[PDB]
Amino acid sequence: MKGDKKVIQHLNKILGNELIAINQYFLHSRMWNDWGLKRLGAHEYHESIDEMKHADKLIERILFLEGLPNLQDLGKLLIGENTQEMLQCDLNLELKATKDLREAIVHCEQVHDYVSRDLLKDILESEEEHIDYLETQLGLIQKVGLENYLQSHMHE
Amino acid sequence: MKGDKKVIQHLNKILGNELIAINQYFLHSRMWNDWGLKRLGAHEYHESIDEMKHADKLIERILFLEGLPNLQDLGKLLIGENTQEMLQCDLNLELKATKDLREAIVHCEQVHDYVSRDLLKDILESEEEHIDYLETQLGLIQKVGLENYLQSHMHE
Amino acid sequence: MKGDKKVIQHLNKILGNELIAINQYFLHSRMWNDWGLKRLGAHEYHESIDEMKHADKLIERILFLEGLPNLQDLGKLLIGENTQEMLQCDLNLELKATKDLREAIVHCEQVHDYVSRDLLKDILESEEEHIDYLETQLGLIQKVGLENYLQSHMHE
Amino acid sequence: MKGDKKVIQHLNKILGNELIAINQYFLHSRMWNDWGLKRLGAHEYHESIDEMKHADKLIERILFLEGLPNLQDLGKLLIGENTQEMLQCDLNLELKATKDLREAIVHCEQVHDYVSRDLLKDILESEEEHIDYLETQLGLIQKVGLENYLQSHMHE
Amino acid sequence: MKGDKKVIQHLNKILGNELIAINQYFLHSRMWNDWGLKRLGAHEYHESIDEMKHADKLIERILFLEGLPNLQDLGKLLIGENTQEMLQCDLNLELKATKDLREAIVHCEQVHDYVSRDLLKDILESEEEHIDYLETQLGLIQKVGLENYLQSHMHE
Amino acid sequence: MKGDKKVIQHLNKILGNELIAINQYFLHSRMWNDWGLKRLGAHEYHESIDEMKHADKLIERILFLEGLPNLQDLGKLLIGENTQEMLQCDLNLELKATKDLREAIVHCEQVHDYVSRDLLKDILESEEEHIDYLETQLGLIQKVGLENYLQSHMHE
Amino acid sequence: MKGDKKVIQHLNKILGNELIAINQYFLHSRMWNDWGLKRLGAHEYHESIDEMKHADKLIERILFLEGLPNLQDLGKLLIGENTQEMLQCDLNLELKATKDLREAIVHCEQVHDYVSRDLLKDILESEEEHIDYLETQLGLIQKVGLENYLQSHMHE
């Protein structure tokens, strides 16, 4: 079904954000596991898988609309070097991702692509859940202290 | 069955205290959950449900006694700004509530409304259990430190 | 995640309506049980629980958006004196609720808070189901007669 | 297998009656459900489904006999404005349907299409059962009164 | 609950499209079965049932909104004479249906009938899934050839 | 445990090939699914997952050796426009990957990193299985013809 | 089957290292249990058993190759005096073990004793896993602090 060219461009932009997030979260997961923070490692692994599932749905939608999914142009990964910075890097990425999701939804609404809008709304709900998790973890570091926060994430 | 007018007034006063407690405990529960202190959030949620069940019984008793349950007047919620204050706000409310329960029981006894006394005694037992929990949490903060206390309430 | 101030005010307004409905439906439920109309009491009890669940979701969203949920202000309960009036009181409350939900959704759309819109739309779907239930009960009273209508709601 | 041209015309007339009945019974079902007469709504839904099954068999037989099943020409639906009228509308349709079935069977017998006759006989047995149901309900309205009759069909 | 007059007109227009699709798909299903292409026949039967379920939901919504569901006016069925035409006839009908769904959603949004919009959006998702299936079948006829494509749809 | 710098560079080169293959095979999978060739889509999906698992093991090994896994550089994806070209693009990538695996094993052996050698040997075994699959599919297309080959990959 | 003399000497050197590790890890295990650090005690017990299993396989190989397994000569145990030192003592022993394994594999390869090489490679993989565990524990001490680290290893 021929889709709106600019909708397809938005979908490819959201896809690109998901492709960044997949790799950033996967690497953060394996860094945390390497450091013995296996509860963080496991949670971040599931965050990466969730992004993989969003990217799948976006690829499938682009193809149905007769566009070409762009899996080639990988943007900048935000890789932290300590737990607090890794969480902040994930949060910064998610905040960019939700800004792009909102702009894409606006355009879907204007050209009446209501199914594309609904997919993007579902993705946006998942990313706002991720923002909640991230903001909460950063708050917990402040409340319980870094050493306790890390201690509580050693064991899965 | 026509009940004593002042018994009904006493029951409506206890119900008013329970209505405050429901909302105060529910809000504290959701604040703790938002902050990631999910063991506190869950325990406080169960406190709120317990007050809901007490309010239900009071409403049912008032109607059997041919009175009008007062769900319209809501007194002042005591909302803390951090974990220590929230626990103290709950404890301050509970101590007011047990004072009012004791005065209500005195009056039921004097007009021979022994069934209402028995209900109020059961509610009082629950409120004293809640006081014990609250006093114990405040003591633990002193014994293990606030940071450890909070750490121990992150995970259910 | 910092939300739009006016979204939060709308969410608190909706929460305010839900808090009225919780108490109004709970009281109506217990009145109907006291009168031996236990099928009405059970159904109205589940309406009250449904509003509690909506209130929970709203409180949770407000906190995520870094607002203060308002559980302190309780508006006017509409309590009937007989079954027909109680049903009409519930219907009047629900018509106000859905008007306010629609205005809140307009605003969420304008500021691109698509997740708050989606929550409010789900609540609106539940309230329209409640409106259908209430309109249908008032119509059944006309079709079968008040005495038959009440008879059919004696046993659960 | 080439069928008799007039048999196929008869089968298409029967099919035409079933297509009216499907829609008429389906709309009546959903009207009764909307009014809270769920027992009537459920029963009328099952009547609609049964006519769908008859239409299916007629379509299949016509195609086997190398005719064109007419799903395009929808005759007049008889929709009532209250329960008694809806039942009477269904009954009037059924009495027309059984008259056309009998005429179709006469012709099948004359041209030795005994398999088409057997199918129409089975459909006719179903339609006479539906007539029994409808006549019985109209008789019950008189025997128990309309208010009781409707009361007995509120709940499934 | 009194609905917007033009919403109701749009819902009846969507319903009319569904009623065409029910009959068109059912007839195509039974033609394919008659030809021994039972896998196509079974799939097309399920498409017809899906349209039956959408029609049901639209009828229910129109009645709740105090409108009259139009099951009397049946538009033009697009019936093909071979597999390739039957699939293209279904796709042509689906593309008109989605145009009409988009225009209905625009109006629902303008008058704040967000629950009707949500219903139409769900139906639109189902119709886009049907378009995907249909476009894919026409593409497979090209990629595997017509004889293979038909061969692969003989047996369930 | 600090690893040999050139081993880590080889591991990152292998990881780079796996990252290309993940995306290429995932896109090919979803292209085949969009075209209705779901058996090809499923098989190619499982090849993508396999490469994901290889990439995971490489990331973990590089971190253990105190290197930085390179998930930022993505080389050129080879995306075909039809089934034969897609298979040949996968085969070309695999043949580059196995060449690079062999050079890396030579260097692991020279510096006595026998565990890295063993991991790369296991990956090489998987890639030679993939080469077998691809070469075999290309041979089958020649033996049974493209139309039959695609027909046999329509259904899982 | 008569083995290479120097291969057997290498196997006996590896066995010598395993015999040290068995005793060193078993004593550290029982020290940690005595101190109430039972999670460390259990984990170190399992490391000791793993070394027992490697020693068994080496003894079995030496005897097959017609050599005499040396269980008489026990080298210097590295026993720590606190948790940090004990983990470091284990790590120091493991790093010497892996050096000796690599040198043994070199010789096995040169004289074509590929089965002995394979056994030593499997042991080497286990010892590198043990090095990963130890380095990770020493890193956790730095990140969570010694008091938290020990706290986390009190209970199993």
Ligand code: HEM
């Ligand atoms: C650094 C790149 C990637 C890594 C390291 C990676 C890793 C993984 C792993 C380890 C799994 C679990 C497999 C299993 O054990 O069953 C997985 C699953 C999956 N991946 Fe990836 N992946 C990557 C990229 C992608 C991309 C780019 C996509 C889509 C475009 C994707 C889509 C999926 C899907 C759909 C699943 C299945 C999840 C489920 O339902 O359980 N992945 N990935």
Ligand code: HEM
């Ligand atoms: C007059 C005030 C209230 C009364 C009398 C009341 C009563 C009840 C009762 C009897 C229950 C079921 C307990 C059980 O299953 O044993 C319940 C459940 C619940 N209440 Fe309330 N309640 C009130 C107010 C509230 C408020 C203001 C909230 C705010 C969120 C709330 C949230 C809940 C929730 C989330 C449940 C669980 C429902 C479920 O998932 O089953 N309640 N309430």
Ligand code: HEM
């Ligand atoms: C107003 C038009 C129609 C409506 C609203 C309607 C509605 C329905 C519904 C809701 C179902 C059950 C779906 C489920 O399983 O949940 C159904 C089943 C069915 N319909 Fe229809 N339908 C319509 C027209 C037709 C027509 C015209 C035919 C044949 C030409 C037909 C044949 C069938 C059959 C064979 C079944 C399955 C019966 C069984 O359970 O064995 N329907 N219909």
Ligand code: HEM
């Ligand atoms: C201080 C010296 C040692 C101690 C305290 C020790 C202790 C133990 C214990 C407690 C068990 C498990 C007993 C059970 O509950 O079944 C065990 C198992 C075993 N030990 Fe030792 N051991 C020592 C030395 C050795 C040596 C020198 C060897 C071989 C060279 C060895 C080989 C084994 C084997 C093969 C097992 C079987 C465990 C399994 O796979 O289930 N041990 N040892």
Ligand SMILES: O=C1NC(=O)c2c(NCc3cc(Br)ccc3O)cccc21
């Ligand atoms: O919280 C409240 N509890 C109440 O009973 C109530 C109200 N009662 C209405 C009423 C009902 C009867 Br039957 C007889 C007299 C009468 O005034 C009105 C507003 C708020 C409340």
Ligand SMILES: O=C1NC(=O)c2c(NCc3cc(Br)ccc3O)cccc21
């Ligand atoms: O219903 C109510 N919801 C509320 O948030 C609330 C109150 N807030 C206390 C508070 C908490 C924080 Br943290 C930051 C500021 C602040 O004022 C007080 C009374 C009643 C209510």
Ligand SMILES: O=C1NC(=O)c2c(NCc3cc(Br)ccc3O)cccc21
């Ligand atoms: O209700 C209807 N039943 C029908 O068969 C039908 C139509 N048939 C199309 C057709 C198919 C073939 Br193969 C050969 C001739 C032919 O006309 C067209 C419109 C409406 C209907």
Ligand SMILES: O=C1NC(=O)c2c(NCc3cc(Br)ccc3O)cccc21
């Ligand atoms: O397709 C049709 N949908 C309909 O509602 C309908 C008809 N309705 C009769 C009716 C019922 C009521 Br209650 C109120 C007004 C009213 O006119 C009659 C013929 C055909 C149709």
Ligand SMILES: O=C1NC(=O)c2c(NCc3cc(Br)ccc3O)cccc21
């Ligand atoms: O693909 C990537 N793999 C990575 O490790 C990585 C990054 N690492 C940050 C980093 C840099 C240095 Br210098 C030392 C330690 C360190 O953690 C940053 C961007 C992209 C990537």
Ligand SMILES: O=C1NC(=O)c2c(NCc3cc(Br)ccc3O)cccc21
């Ligand atoms: O650790 C030890 N391993 C051993 O095999 C061993 C000993 N074996 C004596 C022996 C047995 C045979 Br059969 C053939 C030759 C031979 O000298 C004696 C003392 C200590 C050890």
Ligand SMILES: [K+]
């Ligand atoms: K601690």
Ligand SMILES: [K+]
């Ligand atoms: K009666």
Ligand code: NA
């Ligand atoms: Na939070």
Ligand code: NA
């Ligand atoms: Na956590």
Ligand code: NA
């Ligand atoms: Na506790």
Ligand code: NA
């Ligand atoms: Na009573």
